[PDB]
Fold this sequence. Notes:
Chains A, B: Residues 12-430 form the USP domain. By secondary structure, chain A is α+β, with helices and mostly antiparallel strands.
Amino acid sequence: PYDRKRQDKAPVGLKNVGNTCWFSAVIQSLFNLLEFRRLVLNYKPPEHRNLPFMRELRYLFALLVGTKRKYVDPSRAVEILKDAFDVSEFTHKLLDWLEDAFQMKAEEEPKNPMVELFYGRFLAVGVLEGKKFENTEMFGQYPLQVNGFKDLHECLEAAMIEGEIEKSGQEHWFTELPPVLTFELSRFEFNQALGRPEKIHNKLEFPQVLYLDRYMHRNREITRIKREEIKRLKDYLTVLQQRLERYLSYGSGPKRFPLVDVLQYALEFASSKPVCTSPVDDAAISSRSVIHKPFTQSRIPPDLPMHPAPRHITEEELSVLESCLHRWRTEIENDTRDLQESISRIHRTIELMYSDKSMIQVPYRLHAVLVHEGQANAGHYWAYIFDHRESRWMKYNDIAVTKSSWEELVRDSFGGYRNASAYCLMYINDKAQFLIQEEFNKPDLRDFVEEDNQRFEKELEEWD
Amino acid sequence: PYDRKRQDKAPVGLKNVGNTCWFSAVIQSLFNLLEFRRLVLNYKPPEHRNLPFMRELRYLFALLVGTKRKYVDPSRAVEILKDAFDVSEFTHKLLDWLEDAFQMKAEEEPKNPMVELFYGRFLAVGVLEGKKFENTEMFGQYPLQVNGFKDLHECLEAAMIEGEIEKSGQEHWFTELPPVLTFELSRFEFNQALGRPEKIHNKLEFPQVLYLDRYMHRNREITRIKREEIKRLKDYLTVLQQRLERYLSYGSGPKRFPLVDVLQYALEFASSKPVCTSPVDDAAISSRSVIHKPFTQSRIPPDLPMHPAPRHITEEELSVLESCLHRWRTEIENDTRDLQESISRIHRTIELMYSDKSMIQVPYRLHAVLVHEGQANAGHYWAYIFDHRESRWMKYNDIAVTKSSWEELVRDSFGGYRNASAYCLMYINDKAQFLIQEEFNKPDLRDFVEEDNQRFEKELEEWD
Amino acid sequence: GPNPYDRKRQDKAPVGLKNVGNTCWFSAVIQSLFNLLEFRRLVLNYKPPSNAEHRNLPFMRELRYLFALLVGTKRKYVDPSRAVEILKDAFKSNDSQQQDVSEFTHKLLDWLEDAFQMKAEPKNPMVELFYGRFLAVGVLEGKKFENTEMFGQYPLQVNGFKDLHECLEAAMIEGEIESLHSENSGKSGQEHWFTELPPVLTFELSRFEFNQALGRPEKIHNKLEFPQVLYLDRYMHRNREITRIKREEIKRLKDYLTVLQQRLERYLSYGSGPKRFPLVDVLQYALEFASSKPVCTSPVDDISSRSVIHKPFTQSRIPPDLPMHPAPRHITEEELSVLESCLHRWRTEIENDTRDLQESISRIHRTIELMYSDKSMIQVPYRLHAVLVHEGQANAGHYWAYIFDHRESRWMKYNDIAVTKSSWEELVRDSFGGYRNASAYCLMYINDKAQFLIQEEFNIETLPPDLRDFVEEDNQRFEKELEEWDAQ
Amino acid sequence: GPNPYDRKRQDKAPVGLKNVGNTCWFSAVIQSLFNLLEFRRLVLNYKPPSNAEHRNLPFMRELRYLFALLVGTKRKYVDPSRAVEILKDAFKSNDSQQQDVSEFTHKLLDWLEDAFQMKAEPKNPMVELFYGRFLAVGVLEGKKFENTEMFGQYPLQVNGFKDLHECLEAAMIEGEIESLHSENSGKSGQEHWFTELPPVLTFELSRFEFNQALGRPEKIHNKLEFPQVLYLDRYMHRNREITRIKREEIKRLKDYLTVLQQRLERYLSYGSGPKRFPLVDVLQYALEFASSKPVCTSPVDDISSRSVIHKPFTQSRIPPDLPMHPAPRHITEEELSVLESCLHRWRTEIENDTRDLQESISRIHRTIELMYSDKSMIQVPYRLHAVLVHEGQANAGHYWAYIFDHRESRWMKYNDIAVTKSSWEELVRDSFGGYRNASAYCLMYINDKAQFLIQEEFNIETLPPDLRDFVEEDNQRFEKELEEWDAQ
Ligand SMILES: [Cl-]
Ligand SMILES: [Cl-]
Ligand SMILES: [Cl-]
Ligand SMILES: [Cl-]
Ligand SMILES: [Cl-]
Ligand SMILES: [Cl-]
């Protein structure tokens, strides 16, 4: 334990204090959100054990910006939180206390600067057996179910639509968006074979920049139309995928093979030299090689009749077969190509449905990804957080803070690639330049001489 | 630990004393060989630490026949053996000491009763580049390599033949067989992909009764002939298996399918209703059911043309195809059946090669099977030993001695079925009735009042 | 082919039928009927009404001829062209509904029933053999109903059923039924119970299910077994109360059977990631890793035979025990002792539980299979007489049949011109499904108490039995046909 | 088909060749030669000897006609019947050795070489284009030898080689060679080095290997890549000493590369039993088991929406944490703490080692791929001109070709009557193997320094270039052929 807890111009880690990986992830995520870091740092207090937790969190983020060491011990902050008693219940109370802390600071003087960052509003419009309704709900983290979806947009759309819109239905439309937009990616589904709920492992993609234009209430008439076009296109896309499958998995029996091979090999059989008998009736570097003329074949096998082959065939029989099976093969080959072109064409059309400039004006940039691996009410959490000034992805895994990549993030967060997959996505408004508010140069924390002491106490290294 | 170490008319187990499972297996195997049990029990001594080990082994088998408890602690016997220093080196020294103990007892008065049980003689006859040789070697455990063999006879034959007999060659022939015949089944082979030696997991079968007649020197002229017949038969067997494979894996491309399906499905295609257009041009328990006439179909699908199908066909084209592909399919179907009959016929001929009464007069009955599971110089050993008086297989696994079956033995010893496979087979001569020498009735050990004390000391059970 | 000795009946074998342009379905249905002796006698001893559809009576006559050849012709197979032509002419109309082989089979039977109906002027001897009655008792959102329906062929959906009893039960049950209205309120269910059984009992085995991936209906290829003798006791209305309680007991047992199969699966497919492995191997291999000799370094560095005597129970080719990767970098003696005790005891626990679960599952399975095995549930035996097989596309393919020769106690394969001596083993490969591209579409069972159905007429008579010996004329023709060939 | 507008050449595209009864091999070899401009000029400007095999000179003349149509005919494809008939007549003898398409191709080229040989009376302009020389230096059980062999097509065995360079190197190396006799004693080896390269360089890609399971020779279907430009610098005799040292360096690197691939495999396929799993999962899942809430009992008992606000970073559908099987029966707090510390630290160790191994393997792979990438190893470029593809049975199947149109800088698919504008992407799917049932059997490369080979004659002339305008006569015929059809 000599000269091990020392920095090298890298972000500070956090101690595990048992199984508090969930704490590291949530905290490091918040801390890397500069405006929130400033709100916690420049916090002065004016119900619960909320205010000592806020005060202990100050000492956590102070020694995390003052660094000096490699990792900080979050023991005092975690102990207050643990004394109040799954990890979600813990995360919930944590946020409760922080919101309540900022509420007391505001109430004394109302806008809650923390609630101003994470919470937004959406409009819920629908019908219940013919009777209309319209409500504007406040939301925080928008929760998503990931079973059977290919990406985040597929996911989100399915969540902002309930029933059948026109009969009972409901549509959600964002009215007010939070500058810090968060999504839950719920992978828990009941496994009948296992007889318990388990995490689903299908790959669900998400972009580095998400355009929330289509989900906006103002774009409600436009999106509804684009949506119906995709309904029709997906319908067409199916019929083609069905027909193409009949070409690729041909046959009426239990085993199907491609039709093109069925025809090729059938013709191979017919064109084989007939056999009238039953198959049961029965360091050379010392050689003077000849010159090989171009376009020839040397190891070409002998042409003698062997089984399996027709017993007999007519010249007319062969000529009929040869003309049939060859023309039909070209027909089959051309149709598979034609079907595949059309499928990709429909796919491209769907992909670029919301690509026009009037649907690209609400950009949200991915700031953090919270990953989980393992059993449901167990496992381990780590995070991928973006270092906006350095323009680089970072892997925050208790004590270990390493320079990562988008490629690393995807393997660990999309699912299927590894036993780990993202449980939460944190997006930041690209227009919201105030969430990354670094101190001018035209380190020296808002704190009062605390990190200066823990950097001197650690400077004390004995030498025998 | 109350009333747990108590018997119920079952054999006694042995404590693990660390990782001494190998000791339990080898000992329990010897102990269940009644004549050897008698030799160790009625042992009186007249170089090494061999004689105290023999004396400690007496106290082991005494408390193992006197039972009283569930399992015995082999700590004192194992400690002498361990003080002399892989498990084979340990097993070797163990046997060394026992042989030396019996040698001293004999030498004082020469036949070694232990060496008289396990060791035999075979004749080694051969040629070395034209020059003949003939040696009669003494053997103990005959070691076998199991890579690429289906059963014990395949295994043994490959070991009693080296090179090319008539050039250099060698043949082994048993001259003197030990009443207690043991085989090593070596599964260690260098894995190139892994870069180290590892146990091979192919299934290698062995019988409950093995006839050693063919390997006998007296039957050398006869066996040599039978052997050449099998060479010719296996040769024929190959050519057929090759031709049959051409029927079952038809095609010239990377993906092969059965020829019969290639013809069936090709005809299915031809007989489909032609389509001139391209595939891109585009709780009901309230019903009054009608009577269904016999031999009819209700859910029968509509007969409308669909892709894939010929664009066009001639009535003459179809008639040619229909006659070709149908007759050739029958031809193919009949040939696969013909080939399969012949293959099974050759297989049966090979199976019954050494079945005649003159090759069934040297029976050896399986008495014990020593199983291993896990890493090479690690893992764990247990044994399957036959209880000849009860006529039942028993699983001897440290402390745990359970009534097993042949079915259990096979799953654990043949390989492939489980991660465990037999490393050793102990066979006993069926004519040798003296290896199962039970005391007359027309328990009361040869020992002097020892088990009577450990049965009284254990009777001491406190009750608070 | 053209040579008449090729089409000469080798005596002691049944007569085949020509294909006449995809009429394999006709061969199967006809040969099935023909091999049902009582029906063969009804068609043979048929005389039409005194003073008399314009197609049913000529078809019956043409089929009288067909049947007459099948008994005593000297030829190998026989040409069903004139019988098929009358039947095919009924669909010569372009503005029809849909013309599949079932529509053809239906009309065929229509005409035969109508022919026997006209003769009955009353009992219709055909309708007496094939049709029965079942009772349909149920609820429709609380409201009760009770109907006794006449049936012919009882149609079954093959689905994912393992056998005929599984298949039949699923078809005779729907929801839940009870004595009292409250015990039924806000529920829909239905139960079928046989009241009258036909001596000739037929089942349709429907394998057509819409394939979403392919976008069309396709035959399902799962294996569905059927016995040589079927006991219809449990499906009897009189056995209703006993079957209800046994049905309820199996409900309870299957419930238990699930929970076990679920727990066992958690042992066999352990893990939280996408790839699951058996728990026992997870523990074994974890311990293998811990017990490996530690390696403190990283696995990266870049840029004739005279054999000695072998003592029993030893190992010769045993590999060297030197440290290699992968291994722990370091471990404590106490760490290893904890791991060794944990992972070993837990492995035994896991091994014992998998064995315990598997015993219990088989035990429940045996209990379920012997539910209807007692003496009071084996008094309605129906013996399998015929199996109609199909292979290939829907609306296409080919049909053939497996029919039992009751007198010589042997299964026979009826495939058009070709009538070959088969086996039960052959029948199963071709009819159960999965084994081959072919599977039975229809099963014909005969009441074991209904002897007469397949018994010969007393003297035992098997010689030409009808007065119109047109068969002698046809045999005389073929005999002179053989002569002409040798005399060329 | 019969209509002459069907067989009308749509101008700006090359002319095809009729199939004449399985002569696809002829089309491929001919179209390949024809698209080699200098050779096209040699055949076109051919005049036979003044005073003069009885089959070679008529074949050359018949091929002169064939080539003349291919340049300026108005028809879509052309009938090679008269040229093929002379060639086929040379094998009309029943008592021959063996007649495969290679024997035919060989005779074809024989006759052409012999034709040009007679004209040379000396340089044979054909032999000057296709044949080269390599040096064969080696030992035969210690005894040295040195031969300079003339070669034409250099034959390659595809085996399990990944690309053409792997393929070629394996063919130009055998054992080990050295300067001193002692360093060679009791060894056999051989090295080939190109001394003279032909401007038209051809390779055979032999995929025929005896299949033991099938009991006959069969084409191998592994993917073997080849570049659009090949640098033959390393195989040059002058580059011998540099290549030797680089060859030796790759030997050392491949050695290292193995040890790593072996160790990595032990991590990815961990276990002692028949089924191996990744070590990382073995540790993860073992820890999952240990951390599960213990269960002391056996797993056997026998016989619109108004949503609430969700706080960020929380989980809603999170399942209940209640004890279930499989789990430890019991565990100690100390037992768990030992396991948790072990299995977690070892997992990080395992994860870091797999990453470390994979980095090093890719690093060695990159080093090997850039071995011959420097400026002194890229001065002998050969550009791919043609690819001859085969599909199907050996001694059967069908041949077609991919030939490059150097003036319009585009790949073309020559398949008999059909000459279509292709791509490199098309070529790869059909020639690399594995992608389709077809794979290239021959590669034709042209020296990039040898411009003339595929350059047009200066004025740029592309109009009929030979005095015998029999082509005008044939065009006149076809034009009146079109007229006759419209006038019927
Ligand atoms: Cl469209
Ligand atoms: Cl093609
Ligand atoms: Cl033979
Ligand atoms: Cl068939
Ligand atoms: Cl009969
Ligand atoms: Cl050109």
